[PDB]
Design a protein around this nucleic acid. Structure first.
Length: 52
RNA sequence: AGUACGAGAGGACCGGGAUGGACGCACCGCUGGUGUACCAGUUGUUCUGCCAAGGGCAUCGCUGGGUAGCUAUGUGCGGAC
């Protein structure tokens, strides 16, 4: 257990936790957007790989 | 006093003790400088009739030292409480 400033280390841990829960929101949103992009790009690969 | 402070690295305020730089005031007793009526060596010519010994001139002829005085680059002291 740190450290020179004994409360700000625990407070830094608690801040990392708040950033972590905001990350739980935003990275799930980004995963949803990324699977939508991969589905659209796989479709674009299919439509480029020949047709009409 | 590696004390306070500081996670570490680092690092005191205050208070004591030495040693310096620059500047200044004195003075030679040391270290040196100079010291043209001090001592010695030595070259050329002239003179004291000659040898020897000396004198004159050649930057004090030149060279090696040097008393007193004057000196700093030398020494003592000051800006302390």
């Amino acid at each position: 257990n740190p450290n020179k400033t004994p409360s700000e280390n625990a407070q830094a841990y608690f801040t990392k936790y708040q950033k972590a829960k905001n990350s739980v929101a935003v990275v799930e949103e980004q995963i949803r957007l990324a699977q939508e992009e991969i589905e659209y790009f796989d479709q674009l690969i299919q439509q480029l790989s020949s047709a009409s």
